[PDB]
Amino acid sequence: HMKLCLVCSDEASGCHYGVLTCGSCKVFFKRAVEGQHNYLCAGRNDCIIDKIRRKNCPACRYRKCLQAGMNLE
Amino acid sequence: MKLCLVCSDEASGCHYGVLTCGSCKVFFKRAVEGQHNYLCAGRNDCIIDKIRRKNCPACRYRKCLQAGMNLE
DNA sequence: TGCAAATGTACTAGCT
DNA sequence: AAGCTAGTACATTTGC
Ligand SMILES: [Zn+2]
Ligand SMILES: [Zn+2]
Ligand SMILES: [Zn+2]
Ligand SMILES: [Zn+2]
Structure with a gap:
């Protein structure tokens, strides 16, 4: 149903830095x-x-962001 | 020369029955x-x-209890 | 209490 | 319009 951030499972807002994520993970990354x-x-x-x-x-949040493919380009 | 029995910081006294830093005093x-x-x-x-x-x-509170902190 | 760092929301800028 | 994300400001949290 509701889109799920691939880092924390909170409701995803969009595809940020290459990865469906939530608002708090976008800015955290x-x-x-x-x-x-x-x-x-x-x-x-x-x-x-x-x-x-x-x-x-x-530390492990950042690690899981990177393993999910997040990048600033 | 006084270490916190929960985190090992500079204990500030015996708080809730246990030698503990200020931070662990408040946290417990x-x-x-x-x-x-x-x-x-x-x-x-x-x-x-x-x-x-x-x-x-969770682990910090577990350690507080293990060390004996209470409201005596 | 104060001060400040970390975290999270809501919003705007700018594109197509 | 419509739909998108990157950025940013603000608020909240959390901690000395
Ligand atoms: Zn997230
Ligand atoms: Zn970890
Ligand atoms: Zn301590
Ligand atoms: Zn733990």
């Missing part, structure tokens, strides 16, 4: 590329990213 | 008072150090 962050995972570089757990691990 | 008070329906994105054994304690409320 651009800020992650062009910004400095000490994103450090606390598990095994392998976390679950869903609508809640996405805030838990930005 | 918030967690214990309201819902703590937190969720872990890993395997319920996330590393909870000064850097990564922000990452997993």
Whole structure:
């Protein structure tokens, strides 16, 4: 029914940077590329990213964005 | 020379029965008072150090309880 | 309390 | 019109 972001499963708003994603992942990805962050995972570089757990691990969120194909060109 | 028994930061005193940093003092008070329906994105054994304690409320609250924090 | 960083929404710019 | 996304400003969250 409702389009699903391929990063967090929140409702997708469009195809952003090459990948159907939600509003919060679009801006999260651009800020992650062009910004400095000490994103450090606390598990095994392998976390679950869903609508809640996405805030838990930005390191694994960024990782799953890239594995989904996001790119700024 | 005083380490937090939850995250290992500069403990600021004995809070809710446990030597703990300021940040863990406040986090446990918030967690214990309201819902703590937190969720872990890993395997319920996330590393909870000064850097990564922000990452997993669920594992942090679990560690608070393991260390003995309570409202005595 | 304050200050600030991170995150998320809603909106505008600009294209076709 | 219609439909799209990238950007941006604002608000909210979260944390010292
Ligand atoms: Zn998303
Ligand atoms: Zn992770
Ligand atoms: Zn602590
Ligand atoms: Zn965890």
